[PDB]
DNA sequence: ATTATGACGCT
DNA sequence: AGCGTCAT
């Protein structure tokens, strides 16, 4: 009753850009602008892998990890950017460019948690609090949330969408009291309000429209962001939670995805996040281990604490590259050869890094794929990083995976290596 | 031949 | 540390 905790203590948002690569690439090619696209990355084998895809192509039916030469034969119309290659390799330095811009105006608001290239979560407790203030009990126009959906409204009492939206906006704005200045619904409304303005100043200052979610924890503002793309903002409730489950597959919640969601499917029997619900924290804790027996018990309630961490930069720089097939590094001069690439272009962000950042890597971690090995690593080795030199470092990391090779013979390399990876890790300010 | 990343958990 | 999971 009174003492049991509901997980409605914060007002978190997750932003996350509209088909981030397809939009850097509109806004700098204006033919490409409200058209299907997608972008692409190599081109020889079947016309390149799509890693993005505008709304328009996706209504053809194109996705990622599609082959272009396959897409066309949905989309024969549909139109195309190549990642940058440097060094022979795809290279995606303007898309993290772009996501820094994205990621300082985001900046201004709030305290930021940097969550992928093209999403970040964001902590409004405070700002939320401020702004309540500044409102004085006033209440909040729908003029204020002009592209804010409400998940679960309207309810009871309609052929467009947008008369849809409003509608159901227009039930949760005559409900709201805002004479609580802790109101929990409340709290989240002001909290939409601010990711307007927030999602306005994106568009304005770099072009880019992105969606949002707006809730009382990551798990929640992740899963709403999705709700309502592309370009529009979704609030979720605590309230809004028993019906949302009752019908979400447990593989939609951000970490249930993979492994451990399909073992709470088969283990359990069930199939929707709610159904969690019937389960005590001890059961859950027996079948899935202390942790995520606690985080799943709390989470199917609509409760998560995981703190929205103030990091806005990423923790590792990397460079790596598929040698598939055929391509497969089968002699020593070719391996050294591309962890000379992989280092040089490593060491030339590495760089950029330091001087924007202030801060140096320390640790240089190496990783390798041989062929057969159908894991993603077939093995990491570490060694000092102690130079921004890139001649060093591939010699380094040579030096660190040499004994990988089974050939008996001088030159060759077997089993021929079919993934080479650098990573600058351990970072130390500077 | 679903590539190039990047965070965090386990032991 | 080196490996695995999950993610975009
Ligand atoms: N599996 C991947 N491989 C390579 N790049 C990826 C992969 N997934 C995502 N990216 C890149 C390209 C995306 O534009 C960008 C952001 O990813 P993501 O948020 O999942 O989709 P998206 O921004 O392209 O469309 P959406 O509007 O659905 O969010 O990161
Ligand atoms: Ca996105
Ligand atoms: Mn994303």
Same mark, same amino acid.
């Given at each position: 009753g009174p003492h049991m905790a509901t997980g409605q203590d914060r007002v978190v948002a997750l932003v996350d850009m509209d088909c981030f690569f397809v939009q850097v690439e509109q806004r700098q090619n204006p033919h490409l602008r409200n058209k299907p696209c997608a972008v692409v990355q190599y081109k020889s084998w079947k016309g390149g892998g799509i890693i993005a895809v505008s709304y328009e192509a996706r209504a053809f039916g194109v996705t990622r990890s599609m082959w272009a030469d396959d897409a066309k034969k949905l989309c024969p119309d549909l139109l195309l950017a190549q990642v940058r290659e440097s060094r022979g390799k795809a290279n995606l330095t303007k898309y993290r460019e772009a996501s820094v811009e994205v990621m300082e105006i985001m900046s201004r608001f709030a305290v930021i948690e940097r969550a992928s290239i093209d999403e970040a979560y964001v902590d409004l407790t405070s700002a939320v609090q401020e702004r309540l203030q500044k409102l004085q009990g006033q209440p909040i126009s729908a003029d204020l949330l002009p592209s804010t959906y409400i998940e679960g409204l309207p309810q009871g009492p309609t052929v467009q969408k947008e008369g849809m939206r409003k509608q159901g906006l227009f039930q949760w704005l005559d409900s709201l009291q805002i004479d609580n200045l802790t109101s929990p619904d409340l709290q989240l409304t002001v909290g939409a309000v601010i990711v307007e303005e927030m999602r306005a100043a994106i568009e304005r200052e770099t072009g880019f429209q992105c969606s949002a979610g707006i809730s009382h924890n990551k798990v929640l503002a992740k899963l709403a962001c999705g709700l309502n793309k592309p370009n529009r903002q979704t609030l979720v409730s605590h309230g809004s939670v028993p019906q949302l489950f009752?019908?979400?597959? =447990? $593989?939609?919640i951000r970490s249930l995805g993979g492994k451990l969601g399909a073992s709470v499917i088969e283990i359990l029997g069930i199939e929707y996040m709610g159904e969690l619900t019937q389960f005590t924290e001890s059961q859950l804790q027996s079948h899935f281990g202390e942790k995520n027996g606690s985080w799943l018990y709390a989470m199917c309630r609509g =409760?998560?604490?995981?703190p929205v961490k103030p990091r806005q930069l990423p923790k590792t720089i990397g460079c790596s590259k598929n040698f598939p097939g055929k391509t497969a590094l089968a002699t020593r001069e070719q391996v050294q050869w591309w962890l000379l690439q992989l280092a040089q272009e490593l060491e030339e962000r590495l760089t950029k890094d330091r001087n924007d950042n202030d801060r140096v890597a320390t640790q240089l971690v190496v990783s390798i794929r041989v062929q057969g090995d159908k894991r993603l690593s077939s093995l990491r080795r570490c060694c000092a990083?102690? $130079?921004?030199d890139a001649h060093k470092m591939s010699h380094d990391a040579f030096t660190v995976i040499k004994?990988?090779?089974?050939?008996? =013979?001088?030159?060759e390399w077997s089993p021929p290596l079919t993934m080479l990876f650098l990573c600058a890790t351990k970072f130390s300010a500077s």
């Open positions: 009752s019908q979400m597959p =447990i $593989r939609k =409760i998560e604490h995981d990083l102690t $130079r921004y004994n990988c090779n089974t050939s008996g =013979i001088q030159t």
